[PDB]
Design a protein around this nucleic acid. Structure first.
Lengths: 53, 94, 51
RNA sequence: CGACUCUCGGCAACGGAUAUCUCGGCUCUCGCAUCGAUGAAGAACGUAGCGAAAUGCGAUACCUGGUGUGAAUUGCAGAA
RNA sequence: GCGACGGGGCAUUGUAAGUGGCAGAGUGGCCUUGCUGCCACGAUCCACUGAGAUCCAGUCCCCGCGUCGCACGGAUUCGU
RNA sequence: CACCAAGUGUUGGAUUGUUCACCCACCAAUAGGGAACGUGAGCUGGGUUUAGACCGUCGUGAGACAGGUUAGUUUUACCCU
RNA sequence: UACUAUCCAGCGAAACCACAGCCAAGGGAACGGGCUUGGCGGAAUCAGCGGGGAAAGAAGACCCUGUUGAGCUUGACUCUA
RNA sequence: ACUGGUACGGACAAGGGGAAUCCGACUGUUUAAUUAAAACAAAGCAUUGCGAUGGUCCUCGCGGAUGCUGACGCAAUGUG
RNA sequence: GGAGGGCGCGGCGGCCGAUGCAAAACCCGGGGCGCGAGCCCGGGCGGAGCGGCCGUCGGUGCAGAUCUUGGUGGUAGUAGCAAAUAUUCAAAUGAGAACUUUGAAGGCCGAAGAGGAGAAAGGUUCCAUGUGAACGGCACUUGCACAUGGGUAAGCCGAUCCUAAGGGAAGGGGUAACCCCGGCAGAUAGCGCGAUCACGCGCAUCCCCGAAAGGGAAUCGGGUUAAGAUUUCCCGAGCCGGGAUGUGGCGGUUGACGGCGACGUUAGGAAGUCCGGAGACGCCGGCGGGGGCCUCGGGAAGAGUUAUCUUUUCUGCUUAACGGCCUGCCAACCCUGGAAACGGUUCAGCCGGAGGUAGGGUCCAGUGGCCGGAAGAGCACACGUCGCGCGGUGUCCGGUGCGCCCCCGGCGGCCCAUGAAAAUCCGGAGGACCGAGUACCGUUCACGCCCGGUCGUACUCAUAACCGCAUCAGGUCUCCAAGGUGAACAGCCUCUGGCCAAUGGAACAAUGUAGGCAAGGGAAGUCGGCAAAACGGAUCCGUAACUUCGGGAAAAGGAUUGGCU
RNA sequence: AAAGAUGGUGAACUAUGCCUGAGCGGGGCGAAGCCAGAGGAAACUCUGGUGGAGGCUCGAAGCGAUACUGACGUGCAAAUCGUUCGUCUGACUUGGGUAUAGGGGCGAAAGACUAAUCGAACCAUCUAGUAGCUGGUUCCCUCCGAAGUUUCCCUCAGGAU
RNA sequence: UACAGGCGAGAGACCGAUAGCGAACAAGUACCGCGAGGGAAAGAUGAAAAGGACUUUGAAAAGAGAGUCAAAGAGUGCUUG
């Protein structure tokens, strides 16, 4: 198990869009999970790892 | 539709709510009375036809009683004695 | 509206939430012996709490 | 012809009966008088170092003064 | 000895994509103002085209094509 | 008309809940009886026969009616044979 | 044609059960799985099934009785707001 | 106007219709978990008493319904 | 059914025995006795008290009781776990993955959503972290589970404040009394205002609760965490109420002028008292205007199609509360003017004959504009890792209407129906009283100073946090409501938002259940056309005996319906 | 047992009323009124239109449930689900607040309903209520051993004798 | 003269964990119901925790050895079973 349940919100709550719009890189899975708070999520969004489909 | 299923499903009205005095959901809101002790009421609701289980609830067990008991025991209200002070007093008898 | 605001109910919710906690291991030694398996821990999904 | 169906024993598992226990109940008898607006009966919610409960207590909060006894409290920690 | 496709037969349906066309109701728009005017647009029709697509699964065949085909060892049981 | 004979057939509709009944029409023939008045964990639920209801009669009334009329829940097999 | 059933892996009850379970006829609480007499007499079984177990659910709702009720009616008895 | 399909609301969506008879006039209402009906309601029709310190009702008294109305009204246990 | 004679158990008075070197209890296809009730003894198990005999006494012996309570079978590893359109592949992790998680893919709800939120309700369920003993009727490393932590911050939102239907103290009176009507000699019993000065003046049907929906003192934007954010936080800007005041202005015509007036404006006395209006109003219909959403061109950026073709397709393009200046037509009002060949004009005949049409004004300020707010914000890009963040731009300008939603305006229909009240509250009339100049008066004005208490705020809001024992296909109040086809907020498909969990695999038999179709016949079936099935939308044509003349009527019955140009 | 009494408790379901809020897509039909023209000298009467009324009709949301006597009928569910379908601008729908409680309420009336409960709710008490009737009634052996008859009875399911 | 409460005592041919009170144990507790009200189940290792370190298998839970104990045929399912 890897809990990206928390990652689906926060990313949604800063892109102002649903959780079926947020895309997570399928190679970077562990590092995305490692980011645990919304400030950290913003860094990933900036670098395009999390990107709005 | 009809009975049971439709009777349960609505329930958006409230009647019996929390009583302040006795701490039991029994306060009939739209007639402003408690049916477990009387909330506005000069006297507490006491029934001597309501038998074993109910009577004991109102007898209580979160009671003080001990504080009340000590005046019964002494009967007086004084006493006086301040022994055990450097001298070696009267604080070891017989 | 609020989500019934009245203090009398509100305090009971706080008390019962505190009460619904497991028995703490240590005390089972400092009772002598007798299985302290609380009882006054209830769960919301089953039963109903009366006020 | 294994098997199956049945039965019993020996060892068990199941189960909590039985025996033996009982700081409890039960019933009888005896002594005693002694609640409150001077804030009760009853409730609520808090307070223990570590507590859910019971018990204790009330912001002086598992207790205080005073007094008796005369060294423990203990699950661990702790004050010396 | 055996197997998937393909090819050919057998079937089904009905003539594809692409390309060409004074085929085409018509209409625009530029002139070099057209007894072949050109460029598009245009449902649709026709040619190429009884075409294309599918066709063994419970159709048929092959000596085309490659492998499995472990000259099974993997798994197991049986005595008059 | 009588015999051996159940080997093999013995019907469709109209109407009525009616089997029965009574017609139409065929036909070699359209026999009669039974099986928990064969046949509801196979059905249907139309009759009978609940609770709603209308009418008539009887009854002071409530109600009743071998009088009529309508609408009204058909549960369970996986066990053993 | 779907979804089941079926078959699998996992998961997994209940109703119900005196003891059980092959027929025929006889007598018999006057309609037998068992008795009696004949016929019989597959181990171990699955998918089915609706004849039977007068299968199960429901101290028959009907019907009768009880010196048992209750709803109702009244020109009952007896009182009364 | 050309042209296609067995054909053209092609899917999806979306009243079967008529004639009589019985019955309730109607739309409306109800037996909630077997009965939506011809039952219940109903407009309309007929119909009540009390002129008031009185009618009809409650409450044992007071006060209260009708009646912030009061005979083209209000009520008749809401009649038929 | 009676009587008779016994047996066994528990306890008590007597009497005698037995024991950790192994009591009682319990087990025993082990022995023996008695007709039996029962007894005796051995072996095994066991570990602290017990039995026999003589008297005494009972809550004294069980197979049942549609028995009571506990345990356990067969049933049965059997019925089943089948509604909700649906999963699949690869990777990550882990001992282990159809189900977790991520991607890819397929789909589904189809904006009256399986949606984003609030009510009610629950109460921490929200989120992290730990994590599989129980529980998620499969599985499982996952969980709305269990353990461990954290989290809800308000002068402006609600409650509060306020009244309603209504409830209920107080009085009088019944009722012992509980309890019930409800006010009375609060009426020459005191509450309220001046009033600081002690005294005078004025008045009721009181006084509180009662909608966390009525009614209402006052906030917006951006950012943030686990989350709702006007609400937490923060910037910037307000706004209301209370208190203090100082500065400016207001007023010597003592309590402002100008304007034909309607009325205009930074002030422009005002005691008792009065009166009005505001709070303040039904429902339906059509119409007007607005906002947003929808449609669409140009233009500035990024994305896609991109064999092929298409200046094609998609997407960002935003501007607040609050304030300035300006601005609304209907309604209404002022002035001009004097109308017959009478006019404008409503869904009801209404403007004008107590002065219209027409000309010029005035008013209600919904709203838009431009400016302030306010880009310092936000959005889209490029570049940078110079990173918990760096530097730059661009972010604009039009159009269209039976569109959709909501609002707001003024009308119209309805009625034997004519559709609340209060807190809150200003106005006018009223003119007492107080008005001065080197100051006193305004202090409903602007600007400046300070302050604003109490309580709720997590989150779900349901095919899984609510109620039905329950992660139950049920039920449960409300707000937002894209695109097509089409009348459609119908169905169907899709956007946006949300799931992919409906135990999974295999065969896919009969038999079921659910869905279709059948030549020829056409209700002969059946108690009965029960439902399947057909008709169906619309345009045109055609339309009955009868009737309360309104209807039947969409009668019946026919024909028509495309693509495209 | 069915009940009966006494004292209490419920309008959170539902019944109805009051107060205050919400919600009802788009048609069919084509009312009063209004208007033009026409005929008529008049009194008057035609025709084409406008307009959008109704306890009106088709039909979504909502609300209801007619038939299959379907599915299910040890269910998803102590009343659900499918199809078919009634109603859908008013006697409409529905919430909150508020009123009425047990011989009582409420009822457009079914004896219906009043929290899975209604020909008199539920709860506790009186109550350990009563029942000629059904069920069960517990260790052994011995000896003796019946009767369903007479008489009376609101008695003929039972007593007395 | 009374005394089923309260407080503080003495006793019984009382009961022995399905018994005794509803409750020997956190009991009027948990829980049930909208409420009035209804209302459980649940005592025993051993003298002492001496509550099984350590080694090993297993993902873990557990197991197997061992340790401890008079006894694990006493391992918080705990005396007898």
């Amino acid at each position: 198990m890897v809990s990206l349940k928390l990652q689906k919100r926060l990313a949604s709550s800063v892109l102002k869009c649903g959780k079926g719009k947020v895309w997570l890189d399928p190679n970077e899975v562990n590092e995305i999970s490692m980011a645990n708070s919304r400030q950290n999520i913003r860094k990933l969004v900036k670098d395009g790892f999390i990107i709005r489909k | 539709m009809g009975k049971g299923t439709g009777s349960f499903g609505k329930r958006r009205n409230k009647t019996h709510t929390l009583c302040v005095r006795c701490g039991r959901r029994s306060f009939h809101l739209q007639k402003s009375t408690c049916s477990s002790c009387g909330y506005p009421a000069a006297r507490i609701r006491k029934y001597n036809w309501s038998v074993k289980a109910i009577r004991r609830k109102t007898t209580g067990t979160g009671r003080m009683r001990y504080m009340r008991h000590v005046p019964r025991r002494f009967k007086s209200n004084f006493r006086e004695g301040t022994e055990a002070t450097p001298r070696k007093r009267a604080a070891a008898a017989n | 509206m609020p989500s019934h605001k009245t203090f009398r109910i509100k305090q009971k919710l706080a008390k019962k939430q505190r009460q619904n906690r497991p028995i703490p291991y240590w005390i089972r030694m400092r009772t002598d012996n007798t299985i302290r398996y609380n009882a006054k821990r209830r769960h919301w999904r089953r039963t109903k709490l009366g006020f």
